[PDB]
Paper text:
Here, we show the high-resolution structure of native E. coli FocA, together with the H209N variant, and describe the dynamic pore features that couple to the protonation state.
A FocA-H209N variant that exhibits an efflux-only channel-like function in vivo reveals a density consistent with formate located directly at N209, abolishing the channel’s amphiphilicity. The resolved structure of FocA-H209N at 2.97 Å (FSC = 0.143) exhibits minor structural differences compared with the native structure, but the polarity distribution across the pore is disturbed due to N209. The isolated FocA-H209N variant revealed the presence of a density close to N209, which would fit various small molecules, including formic acid. Capture of a potential translocation intermediate for FocA validates the disturbance of the polarity distribution across the pore, while in vivo experiments show that an E. coli strain with a mutation in codon 209 of the genomic copy of the focA gene, and which synthesizes FocA-H209N, has impaired growth due to reduced intracellular ATP levels, correlating with massive formic acid efflux. Immunological analysis of plasmid-encoded FocA-H209N revealed that it is as stable as the native FocA protein15 and PflB is also stably produced in strain DH4200 (synthesizing FocA-H209N). These findings demonstrate that the amino acid exchange in FocA-H209N does not affect either synthesis or stability of the protein and has no indirect negative effect on FocA’s interaction partner, PflB. Cumulative analysis of all protomer channel contacts over all simulations performed showed that interactions around the EM density are highly prevalent. This indicates that this location is important for translocation, promoting the possibility that the captured density corresponds to the substrate.
Residue numbers in the entry:
A (entry chain A), B (entry chain A), C (entry chain A), D (entry chain A), E (entry chain A): 6 to 280
The structure:
Amino acid sequence: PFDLLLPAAMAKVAEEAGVYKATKHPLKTFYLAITAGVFISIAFVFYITATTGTGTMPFGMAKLVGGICFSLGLILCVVCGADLFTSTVLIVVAKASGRITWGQLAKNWLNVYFGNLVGALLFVLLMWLSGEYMTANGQWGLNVLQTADHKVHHTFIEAVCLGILANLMVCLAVWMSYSGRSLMDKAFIMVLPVAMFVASGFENSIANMFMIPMGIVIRDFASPEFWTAVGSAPENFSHLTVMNFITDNLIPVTIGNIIGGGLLVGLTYWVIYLR
Amino acid sequence: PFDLLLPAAMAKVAEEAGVYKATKHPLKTFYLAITAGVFISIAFVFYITATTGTGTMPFGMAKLVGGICFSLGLILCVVCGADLFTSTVLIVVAKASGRITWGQLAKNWLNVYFGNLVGALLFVLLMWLSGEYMTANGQWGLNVLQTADHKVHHTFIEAVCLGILANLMVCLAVWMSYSGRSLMDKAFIMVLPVAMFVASGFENSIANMFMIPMGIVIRDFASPEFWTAVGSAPENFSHLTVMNFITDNLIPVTIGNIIGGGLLVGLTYWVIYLR
Amino acid sequence: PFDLLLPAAMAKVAEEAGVYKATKHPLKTFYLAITAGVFISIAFVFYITATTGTGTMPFGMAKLVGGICFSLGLILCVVCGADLFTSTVLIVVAKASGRITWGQLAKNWLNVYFGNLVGALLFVLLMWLSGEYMTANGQWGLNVLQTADHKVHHTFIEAVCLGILANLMVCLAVWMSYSGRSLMDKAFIMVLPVAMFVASGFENSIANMFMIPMGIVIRDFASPEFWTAVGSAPENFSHLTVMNFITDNLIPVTIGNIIGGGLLVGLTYWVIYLR
Amino acid sequence: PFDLLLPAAMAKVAEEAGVYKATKHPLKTFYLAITAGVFISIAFVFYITATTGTGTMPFGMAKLVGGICFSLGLILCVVCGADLFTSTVLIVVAKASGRITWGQLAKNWLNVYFGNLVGALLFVLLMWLSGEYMTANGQWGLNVLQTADHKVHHTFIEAVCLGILANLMVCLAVWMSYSGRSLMDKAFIMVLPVAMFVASGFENSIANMFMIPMGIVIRDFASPEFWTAVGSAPENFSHLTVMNFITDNLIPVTIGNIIGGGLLVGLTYWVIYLR
Amino acid sequence: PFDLLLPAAMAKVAEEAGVYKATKHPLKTFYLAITAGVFISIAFVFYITATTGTGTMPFGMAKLVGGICFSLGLILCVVCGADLFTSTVLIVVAKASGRITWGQLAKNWLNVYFGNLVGALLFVLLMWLSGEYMTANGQWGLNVLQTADHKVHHTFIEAVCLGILANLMVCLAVWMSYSGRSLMDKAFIMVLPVAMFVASGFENSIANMFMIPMGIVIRDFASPEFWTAVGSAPENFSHLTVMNFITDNLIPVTIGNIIGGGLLVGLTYWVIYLR
């Protein structure tokens, strides 16, 4: 009563949440994953808006403010009960406890991944129809294009490790929020961990599902006035391809996400406490 | 007790609030809508004051600070119980639940819209009688004029999508505040979502009801000293017309507001939880 | 229990506080008004200290930081139970409810006004005896002089409307703090509304009771070294006169304060809820 | 329960705390005063570290950040139960109530003053042995020397009034923290009042007990490399003398501290409420 | 209930936590120490990311932001129940109380130290495999190298005193967090004390266990493109050697850590309260 949960109780509520999320109806899970993807896309839009025009600003300060803005998406995911893949990886605790089977875990992960992708694509369509890429004389679109272009230029091991580091922070934020008992203890304990992985540049698969397709759409369908304003051409971002997106980024970053989240946070604390 | 509300309880308190707001007396609803319009105009005044003179400042940082300042209006609307149209669209949850009829919804929406417009006009009159447009050697009035001029230059589909995105954030902030149990959990969970839509540039109909008429009034009745100080002439803002305001902005942004708020937040969560 | 007060309960605690404040002993009211004036003078000293040297800083950011600093005075007034005139105007709710008479209201308002003036003068004497006007090579005194000089150059209608807007924000902050149940919900819900009216430039009579006499004292009794450092002369601020202070500022700003506070916040919510 | 304390209860808990602190064992009081002096020295070290290199930064912003950093010391003093002289002056409430005698008050004040001085000297020794004065190519030591040099150049009446203003803010912060019921309401209500007196330049005797001896030690025992880096010589700070420290600063600032704290905060509220 | 713990209760919960941590199973202690080292490495990564490119920024502001970012690691250690050596030194309270023996204390300290080192090395390997040292055209790696190089250039007495000061702040933050009763009172009371020791430059042994080996790895295995971008050569950091790391830094900083933490915080408060 009125007290923060101790780590053992944190692990037991994590186990219970894993069982609850794994036993939910597939259609409800799909809808919640769509909302989670929409929230993550909202967070990346805030990040891009905040970090626009900060070239003269110091690198660390601008990235820190961008991460503080980006934490809104995962705060929304936690508060609104949406199913985010980075958070659904933590059902490995319930899997190890034996309360859920491997088939339930596989179905939940697939459903949440697909729903997150659908939500990210829907928000990409909305963002493009809004005309946001011409903000600040095209600097918003240029920021989107540069952010997307940088993510497609990583090695397999580098992408895997970046995904491990990103899902480490996301699952640590979720685990810490498990201790909170109010809307504020479950939101303010989650700004710094997310801001770390956003400012550092760690790669999140769900966030990339919004980022890279947005960059591809802007590279393809931008008006010539946008290119004239930004002083660049589409051939400067030729590497922004769907196949390159899925191959150079999606698979390695996703594999790193599983390895980080449900091996370095879920399983380790299950071993420490719930074994 | 002492715990944040779970999403199912959040949806049920949203339904109950919708029924309560739809069954209120029309005169009380009109007065509360007037207060809500006054609060929204207060928020836009804070935004304009904060963002004045930030041309040299980075775009994202200045817009983020402006949004943080702007969140005060919706915080006031939630705390003081005022009826804001962006929030009254969420009575579609109670409509879908069957607790209220279509006539009640239509009457509530019309009354709240009219009251918000009346409150915005009253605060426009107060702001003009205050002489605030000559602050910082006319940079306050110039900021108001530029903000109003930019909003009148959007396509129908772009305005509709911008309104969808704005009401998405507003209704998401309201839905998240439904989880809080104190004045602080119902205020700090609402700064970031509002700051997102303010910094990004998403269009809110109620906020525009204060913004654009203020710009028209300043364009019409400004002293020649103000124009000399700002180095511009009224013909530079010829497009700032009442008919252009209602046609290019009000109808599309309002339609986008309904489509965002009571289709992408209210109905989706009613389907997920209250069906 | 553990929950924020609903607007009806907020209005009833406002009514009860009005009755309690109107029925207090006159000497206790005088002492509390003196403490309130001291707190308001403390807030203006923080504002001046924070905004010193921010000429190169953007206008909005500097004024926002100054308002955040200024909110300390009204936070102190609320927490410590001091009687501030901007807050005592809200006893019009209890007057309309019939719990107090017109004579009690008049006596309370006069006593609180006189006590606030006495406290502001005492803090002016303390500030002058401290030697603070020579801070930053006289930039503190120059900031005080410019702030005082700008306030004496407003029309009657402009001053009345500025006072209306200022007391609107002050009474709205008090009304919102009525909802809070802890020291933090009653302090953080009060920073933004005060910061708005401070950054915008709205005129508060009690704050001006410290500001303008301080400027007059500095204009009169400053050392020639201060004038040499600031590169100005007393004849540059000839308009800073006590008669000009009371006539151009005190009466119109005070009348606007009553019209804002106990007509646009107190009476409107009494009509909505307590009628 | 769950509610902030009303001013009458705040005064009664202040009286009870005064009796408790006055009736404590002298050795425990001495140890707690040593810890309080260490905490105050920690706060001044944070202030110096934060304000180092901020010459190009605006005066008010840099001093505000320095005060926010400095509030940590008094937050530590309140949370950890240390006996700080600025806080022990408030036992005048219990003295006026008759619960403690004059001898107890005198012994408590002397013991706390001596313990604070001993703790400040111990932290001065630790800071010198750490080698911190060579941080940022000697700018840390130069900041310490300038801060110490400015404090030794005040008139008796100016020093007395500055001490009155400083202890006013410190005792007001303590009195406001008496209302809080958790670690957060007793810490966040204390940042702004302390930041005011730090940013403004009001003189605290305990803080000066760390500041000035540190400056004397740096002036005496600095390496010639430090002087070469800072581009100055010890003769530029000849006035930094122990006798000048105790005569020009310690006695007047301390007398102002008593007059502020236990006449303008303690006795006034005892008269208002506890008489 | 709902109230912050008084200092006597703070000391008794510190004693109980010491007994609990000293009586835990060695393998669980090792795993928790590994997680604590990972969290500390995460905090140093945030610090490096935040402070990258802030050469033009004022020294104090940049170091303050870096410390605010760095506080995340110790917040994670407290919330997640990890065993950090700087925190395990406080079991000297339980040792003095007689509840645990000297052998238990020695075994706990050795196990926690070894686990922290293993976790720091694992995160060093992950950081190197991520490729983070090429961020901002090698400015991230240059910041890491400079931070590591500066720490290897301290005298024995200076390193001992810096460790004393660092563990003072860490143990004071832990002791203050013992008073909090929620996730927020146990996190926000811990940002300022950690930020102090990070901004000032006080040396923490566990943090150095991540910092210096990372610098050695970057100095050894960096690509020539990184050196070309940063405009430097490995011979500029020849002193970055493992033997120099353990001799010039590890032993003196660790000894200072024990002397600070479990003599100046644990034993002093045991003497004041628990004797």
